[PDB]
Amino acid sequence: MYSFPNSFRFGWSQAGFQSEMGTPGSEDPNTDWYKWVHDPENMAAGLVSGDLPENGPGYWGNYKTFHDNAQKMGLKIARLNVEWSRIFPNPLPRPQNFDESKQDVTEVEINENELKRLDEYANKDALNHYREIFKDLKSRGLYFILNMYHWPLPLWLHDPIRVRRGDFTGPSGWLSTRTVYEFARFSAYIAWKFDDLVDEYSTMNEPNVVGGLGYVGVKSGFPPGYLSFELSRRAMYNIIQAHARAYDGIKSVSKKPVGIIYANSSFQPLTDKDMEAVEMAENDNRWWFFDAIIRGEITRGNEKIVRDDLKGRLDWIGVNYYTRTVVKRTEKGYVSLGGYGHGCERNSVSLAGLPTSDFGWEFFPEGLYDVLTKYWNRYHLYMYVTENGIADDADYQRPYYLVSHVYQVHRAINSGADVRGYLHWSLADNYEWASGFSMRFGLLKVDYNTKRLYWRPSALVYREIATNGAITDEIEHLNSVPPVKPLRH
Numbered sequence: 001m002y003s004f005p006n007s008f009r010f011g012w013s014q015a016g017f018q019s020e021m022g023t024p025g026s027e028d029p030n031t032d033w034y035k036w037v038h039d040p041e042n043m044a045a046g047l048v049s050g051d052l053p054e055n056g057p058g059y060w061g062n063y064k065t066f067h068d069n070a071q072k073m074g075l076k077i078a079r080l081n082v083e084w085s086r087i088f089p090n091p092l093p094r095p096q097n098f099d100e101s102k103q104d105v106t107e108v109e110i111n112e113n114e115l116k117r118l119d120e121y122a123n124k125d126a127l128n129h130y131r132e133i134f135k136d137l138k139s140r141g142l143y144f145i146l147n148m149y150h151w152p153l154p155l156w157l158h159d160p161i162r163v164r165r166g167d168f169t170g171p172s173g174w175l176s177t178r179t180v181y182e183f184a185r186f187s188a189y190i191a192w193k194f195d196d197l198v199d200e201y202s203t204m205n206e207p208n209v210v211g212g213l214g215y216v217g218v219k220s221g222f223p224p225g226y227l228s229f230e231l232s233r234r235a236m237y238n239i240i241q242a243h244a245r246a247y248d249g250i251k252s253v254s255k256k257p258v259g260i261i262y263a264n265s266s267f268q269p270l271t272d273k274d275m276e277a278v279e280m281a282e283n284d285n286r287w288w289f290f291d292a293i294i295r296g297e298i299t300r301g302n303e304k305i306v307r308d309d310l311k312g313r314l315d316w317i318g319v320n321y322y323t324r325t326v327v328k329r330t331e332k333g334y335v336s337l338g339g340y341g342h343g344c345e346r347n348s349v350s351l352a353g354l355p356t357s358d359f360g361w362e363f364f365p366e367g368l369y370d371v372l373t374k375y376w377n378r379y380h381l382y383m384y385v386t387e388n389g390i391a392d393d394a395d396y397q398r399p400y401y402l403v404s405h406v407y408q409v410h411r412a413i414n415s416g417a418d419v420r421g422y423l424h425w426s427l428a429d430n431y432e433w434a435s436g437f438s439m440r441f442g443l444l445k446v447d448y449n450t451k452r453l454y455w456r457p458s459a460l461v462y463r464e465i466a467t468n469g470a471i472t473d474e475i476e477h478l479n480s481v482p483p484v485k486p487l488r489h
C-alpha cells in the first residue's frame with residue numbers, strides 16, 4: 001500500500017475549448033482556435049486534422065453526467081477553465097490613454113467601477129451557465145481549481161490567419177500589450193463573479209506551449225503558426241506580465257490562492273557526460289520563467305534586472321507532466337534527442353525500449369518525481385499535479401501509466417515535497433487541438449455520435465485509488481512498465 005495524506009485529493013483536469021462543445025447550443029465560434037481549425041488553408045496543409053470542436057464531447061450540456069461519474073469514481077478535485085470568448089465575445093473599447101507602444105505593463109488599475117463597466121459588456125447567458133456548471137460541480141463534493149486561460153483567445157483579440165499570413169496590423173494575440181491589459185481585467189472580473197464557488201485560482205495553462213508552438217514549433221498547427229524566434233520571445237514576455245497583472249487583479253477581489261499551470265518534461269542526460277546539458281535545458285525551459293514570476297528576475301534587452309511588479313506573483317505551482325526529454329551536450333550548447341520522450345513513433349517503443357502512446361510519447365514515470373522535487377527544492381511552493389495522462393483509446397497502457405505516476409507523487413511527498421493533489425488528464429475523451437478527436441486521453445471513452453461516456457478499466461482502477469486515498473495492495477503490481485512484447489514495435 002501507498003497511502004496519501006488525508007487532505008490530498010484525486011481528480012481531473014479539463015479544458016473549455018476541448019470539452020464544452022458537441023451538444024447543440026454550446027457552439028462558440030469566437031476564438032482564434034475555432035477559426036484556426038476551420039481554416040481551409042490550414043486543413044489543406046494538414047496543419048489541423050479537419051476535425052471540428054463543435055462535434056466534441058458536449059460538457060456544456062452534459063456536465064451533470066460528467067460530474068456523476070467523477071463522484072462515482074471517488075474524485076474530490078477538479079480543475080477547468082472559463083472560456084474568455086464566451087464571456088466577452090465582442091470587442092471592448094480601447095483603454096483610455098493606455099500606451100500600446102510601451103513594452104512593460106507594470107500595473108493595470110482595477111476597481112469596483114471598472115468591474116461594473118465590464119459587467120455591461122459580459123455575455124450573461126454564458127456567466128449563468130458557468131455558474132450552473134460550477135454549482136453542480138461543487139454539489140458533488142469537488143474542490144474547485146478555476147483556471148482563467150487554456151489557449152483560445154477572443155477573436156476580437158487575435159485573428160490568427162492574418163498573423164500566419166505575415167500581416168501584423170490586426171488583433172495580434174500575445175504579441176500585443178492590449179491582450180496583456182484585457183487579460184488582467186478578465187481574470188479580476190471572473191474572480192469577482194465566481195469567488196464564492198472557487199477554492200484556488202490558476203491564471204494560465206502552459207503559457208510556454210502557447211508561445212513555443214505558436215511561433216517556433218510550427219508543424220504542430222498551433223495559432224498563429226508564424227515562425228519567429230523574436231516574436232516567440234515577445235509573446236512570452238507579454239504572457240509573463242499578463243500572469244503578474246492577472247495575479248494582482250484577482251488578489252484585489254480575493255484572498256484565495258493564485259497559481260499557474262505549466263508544461264514540464266523531465267530533462268535527462270543521454271550519457272553521464274550530459275548533466276550540465278540537463279541544467280541548461282532546465283534553465284531554458286523552466287527556471288527562467290519561474291524566476292521571473294517568483295523572484296522578479298527577468299532578462300530584458302541584454303540585461304538582468306529585478307522587476308518589482310513581477311516579484312512574488314505566485315502562491316502555488318501547477319505541474320503538468322507526461323514524459324521526459326533526453327538531452328546531450330553540444331559545443332554551442334545542448335540538444336534534445338528524437339526517439340525519446342515526446343519525439344517517438346506512435347504505438348511502438350522508444351530508443352530505450354520503453355513503450356510509446358497513441359501519440360508517440362515514451363513511458364517514463366520517474367520524470368514526475370524529478371520535476372516535483374526539483375521545483376520544491378528551488379521554490380518551496382506547494383504543487384498540484386494539474387495534468388498527467390496518456391493517449392490510449394484501447395486502454396492497454398493507461399492502468400500502468402496511472403498507478404506508476406501516482407506512485408511517483410507518493411514518492412515525492414515522501415521526500416518532503418508539498419504536493420496536495422493529482423489530477424488526471426482527462427476524465428473523458430476530448431478534442432486534442434490540431435490532432436482532433438483521435439488522441440483519446442480519458443478515463444472515460446466518449447462515443448461522439450451519441451455523446452455517451454464509458455468506463456475504461458483504468459477508470460475502475462482510479463476509483464480504487466481515489467475512494468481509498470491509496471494505491472491499494474491489490475493494484476500495486478500496476479506500478480510497472482506495460483509489457484512491450486505483446487505491444488506493437
Ligand SMILES: OC[C@@H]1[C@@H](O)[C@H](O)[C@@H](O)c2[nH]c(CCc3ccccc3)c[n+]21
Pocket residue numbers: 015018205206209263264265320322387425432441
Ligand atoms: O496532450 C494532452 C494534453 C492536452 O489535451 C491539454 O489541453 C494540454 O494542457 C496538454 N499539454 C500537454 C503537454 C505538452 C508539452 C509540450 C512540450 C513540452 C512539454 C509538454 C499535454 N496536454
